[PDB]
C-alpha cells in the first residue's frame, strides 16, 4: 500500500486561514512560526524573540494554563480581533490564531444543542438519531451536504444519514472503499476529532525553520487545527467537486465509529464557536450510538442466554445428552436460534444429524474434510464460506455462512451452524493517485450470508465447552 505511507501529521505547513507560532515552554521564546504569522499577529515576533505583555497580552494566562492540568487553551484577543487556541506538544507550546468570526450568537447555538441533547436522550431509533444530528450540523455549519459515514470491519464506510441544500449530489446509502480514509488518517482522527478545509485550492503556508532548535526534529502537528492536508486528498476533493470540507470524528469506546462529514460546491469557512458546537454534537451522538449499540447487544446476550439455559437443562435432564439439542421440535428450534441459524449439522464420527436447512451429508462430509485442514483453536466462522472454500458455492443458497465447531479433542465430531446466501445490491459510487468518477457503481453480493453478531459467536463458544465437557 503506497496510500498508508504519507506522514500527514508533519507536513511543516499550515492552511492560509490562520497562523501558527511555536514557543519553548521554559522562557516562552519563539522557536518556529508560519511565514504568514506577521500578517495576523501584526508584529515582529520572530525566531529567537521572547514573548512579553507587549508581544502577547494573554502571556500571563497562557503561562498559568501551561502549569495547569487543562489540555487546550482559548483566549479571544479583542485588540487584534483574533481567536487564539494553543495545545501542548511535549516541551513545546503550539499556538494557532485565526480572525475572530463576527455575527455568531451562542444563545441560539446553545438552544439548538439543548434540543439535540434532549432528543437523543429520549431514546429514539439509531437511524432517527443519525439524521437529526446530520440535520443540526447542516443547520449551524451551512454546508451544501452534511452526510454521516459509519465504518464497517474492512474500514470501508456506508453513508447512513445525509442533509443538503441539494447543491451537491446525494451519496445517501452508497458505500466507499477503506482506501478513501487510509489507516494513518483513521488513527489521527481517533485522537484529533475535527478537521476543516475551508478552501481546496489554498496555497500551503510554510513553517520556518523546518527543524525546531529545542527538539532538533520536525514539529508534530497532530493536534494543529491549521495543519496543511495531504495533496492526494485535496485531489480526491477536486475529483468529487467539493471546494470546502469539515469532518468531525464520531468515537465510541475509543474506536473511530464514523464521521460527520460536511462538503461545499464553493469555498466555505466556519467559526470556532460553530466547529466547537459540531464536536459537541458528535460527542452527544457518540453517547447515543454507544447506548443503543449497548442495550441492543445487552438484550441479545439475555435472549441467547435463556436458550443456552434450555439447551444445557435438556442435555443434563435427558437419558442421551444429544437429545437435549435434537430431542423435540422445541429443542431442535433452540439449537438453531442459539446463533440465529437456519440449519445445524451435529456430526459424531459417522453419526450425522442435520437440522432445518443444511447442505447434504455428502456436502458436509466434504466440508468437515476441509475444516480438518484449518487451524481452529476456538471455532471457525464466516459469512462468505465460498470465498474460503470455492467448492461450497455449489450450496451457497443454503450455507454462505457457517459457524463450524469441533466438539471433541479427538477430531471427527463437530457442530456446524448454516446460514443462507442473502443477495443484496451494493451501490459504491466508485470501485475497488485518487479516482475521478464517483458515479453510482452497482454490484450484487453473492455467496454471502447475514453477518455473525459477536453475542452469537460468544453463545456458540460457550455451548462448545458444554458439549466437549459432556463428551469427556
Ligand X SMILES: CCC1=C(C)C2=CC3=N/C(=C\c4[nH]c(/C=C5\NC(=O)C(C)=C5CC)c(C)c4CCC(=O)O)C(CCC(=O)O)=C3CCN2C1=O
DSSP string, 101-162: --S--HHHHHHHHHHHHHHHTS---HHHHHHHHHHHHHHHH--SEEEEEEE-SSS-EEEEE-
Closer residue to ligand X in complex, CB, 244/459 = 244
151 is in an annotated binding site: yes
Bridge partners (DSSP) of residue 382 are: 402
Which residue's entry shows cell 500578517? 39
Which C-beta is closer to a second copy: that of 118 or that of 203?
118
Q: State yes or no: residue 185 binds ligand X (CB under 6 A).
A: yes
Specify the residue, 70 or 127, whose C-beta has the smaller distance to ligand X.
127
State yes or no: 279 annotated in a binding site: no
- End-to-end CA distance of the chain, in Å? 49
Measured from the CB atom, is 273 or 326 closer to a second copy? 273
User: Which value, in Å, is the radius of gyration of the alpha carbons in the chain?
Assistant: 29
In a 10 Å sphere around its CB, with 0-12 CB exposed, 13-18 middle and 19+ buried, how is residue 202 labelled?
A: middle
Long-range residue pairs from 38-44, CB within 8 A, at least 24 positions apart, any chain:
40/80, 40/82, 40/97, 40/98, 40/99, 41/80, 41/82, 41/97, 42/80
Minimum distance, C-beta of residue 294 to a second copy, in the bound complex (Å)? 5
Of 179-187, 353-361, 403-411, 443-451: span binding ligand X (CB under 6 A):
179-187
Give residue 166's region: left, alpha or beta (phi > 0; psi -120 to 50): left
* Near ligand X in 421-440, by CB under 6 A: 434
207 scored as a contact of ligand X (CB under 6 A): no
Closer CB to a second copy, residue 48 or residue 68? Answer: 68
Residue 380 C-beta: closest distance to ligand X, Å: 32
**Least Å from the CB of residue 297 to a second copy:** 8
Contacts of 137 (CB under 8 A, 6+ apart): 143, 146, 163, 248, 260, 262, 278, 281
Q: Is 147 in the site for ligand X (CB under 6 A)?
A: yes
CB of 363 to a second copy, least distance (A): 31
434's contact among a second copy, ligand X, none, with CB below 5 to 8 A by partner kind, is ligand X
Q: How far is the CB of 195 from ligand X (least distance, A)?
A: 4
> Which of a second copy, ligand X, none interacts with 426 (beta carbon under 5 to 8 A by kind)?
none
Task: Determine contact, residues 413/471, Cβ cutoff 8 Å.
Answer: yes
**Applying CB under 6 A, which residues contact ligand X?**
3, 6, 8, 147, 149, 157, 159, 171, 176, 179-182, 185, 195, 197, 229-230, 232-233, 236, 245, 247, 259, 261, 434
Q: Residues within the annotated binding site for Ca(2+)?
A: 150-151
Q: Residues within the annotated binding site for Mg(2+)?
A: 150-151
Amino acid at each position: 500500500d503506497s496510500c498508508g505511507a504519507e506522514p500527514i501529521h508533519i507536513p511543516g505547513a499550515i492552511q492560509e486561514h490562520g497562523a501558527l507560532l511555536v514557543l519553548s515552554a521554559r522562557e516562552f521564546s519563539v522557536v518556529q512560526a508560519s511565514d504568514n504569522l506577521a500578517n495576523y499577529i501584526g508584529v515582529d515576533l520572530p525566531i529567537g524573540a521572547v514573548a512579553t505583555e507587549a508581544n502577547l497580552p494573554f502571556i500571563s494566562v497562557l503561562s498559568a494554563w501551561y502549569s495547569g492540568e487543562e489540555s487546550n487553551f482559548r483566549y479571544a484577543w479583542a485588540e487584534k480581533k483574533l481567536d487564539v487556541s494553543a495545545h501542548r506538544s511535549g516541551t513545546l507550546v503550539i499556538l494557532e490564531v485565526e480572525k475572530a468570526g463576527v455575527g455568531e450568537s451562542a444563545e441560539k447555538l446553545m438552544g439548538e444543542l439543548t434540543s439535540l441533547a434532549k432528543y437523543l436522550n429520549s431514546a429514539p431509533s439509531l437511524e432517527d438519531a443519525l439524521f437529526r444530528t446530520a440535520q443540526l450540523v447542516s443547520s449551524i455549519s451551512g454546508h451544501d451536504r452534511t452526510l454521516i459515514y459509519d465504518f464497517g470491519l474492512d474500514w470501508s464506510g456506508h453513508v447512513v444519514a445525509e442533509a443538503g441544500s441539494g447543491a451537491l449530489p446525494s451519496y445517501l446509502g452508497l458505500r466507499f472503499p477503506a482506501g478513501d480514509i487510509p489507516p494513518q488518517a483513521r488513527q489521527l482522527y481517533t485522537i484529533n476529532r475535527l478537521r476543516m478545509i475551508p478552501d481546496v485550492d489554498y496555497k500551503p503556508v510554510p513553517i520556518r525553520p523546518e527543524v525546531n532548535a529545542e527538539t532538533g526534529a520536525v514539529l508534530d502537528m497532530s493536534f494543529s487545527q491549521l495543519r496543511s492536508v495531504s495533496p492526494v486528498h485535496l485531489e480526491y476533493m477536486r475529483n468529487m467537486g467539493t471546494a470546502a470540507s469539515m469532518s468531525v470524528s464520531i468515537v465510541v469506546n475509543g474506536a473511530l465509529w464514523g464521521l460527520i462529514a460536511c462538503h461545499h460546491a464553493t469555498p466555505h469557512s466556519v467559526s470556532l464557536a460553530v466547529r466547537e458546537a459540531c464536536d459537541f454534537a458528535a460527542q452527544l451522538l457518540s453517547m447515543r450510538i454507544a447506548m443503543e449499540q449497548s442495550s441492543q447487544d445487552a438484550s441479545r446476550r439475555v435472549e441467547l442466554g435463556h436458550i443456552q439455559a434450555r439447551l444445557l437443562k435438556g442435555m443434563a435432564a435427558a437419558e442421551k445428552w444429544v437429545d437435549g439439542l435434537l430431542g423435540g421440535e422445541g429443542e431442535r428450534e433452540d439449537l438453531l436460534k442459539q446463533v440465529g441459524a437456519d440449519g445445524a449439522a451435529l456430526v459424531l464420527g459417522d453419526d450425522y444429524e442435520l437440522v432445518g436447512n443444511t447442505p447434504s451429508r455428502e456436502q458436509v462430509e466434504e466440508l468437515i474434510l476441509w475444516l480438518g485442514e484449518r487451524e481452529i483453536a476456538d471455532v471457525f466462522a464466516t459469512d462468505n464460506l465460498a470465498g474460503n472454500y470455492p467448492t461450497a458455492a455449489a450450496y451457497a443458497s443454503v450455507a454462505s455462512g457457517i459457524i463450524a465447531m469441533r466438539v471433541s479433542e479427538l477430531h471427527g465430531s463437530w457442530l456446524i451452524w448454516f446460514r443462507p446466501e442473502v443477495i443484496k445490491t451494493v451501490r459504491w459510487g466508485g470501485d475497488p493517485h485518487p479516482r475521478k468518477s464517483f458515479e453510482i457503481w452497482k454490484e450484487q453480493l453473492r455467496n454471502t450470508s447475514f453477518p455473525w453478531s459477536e453475542p452469537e459467536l460468544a453463545a456458540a463458544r460457550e455451548l462448545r465447552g458444554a458439549i466437549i465437557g459432556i463428551v469427556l
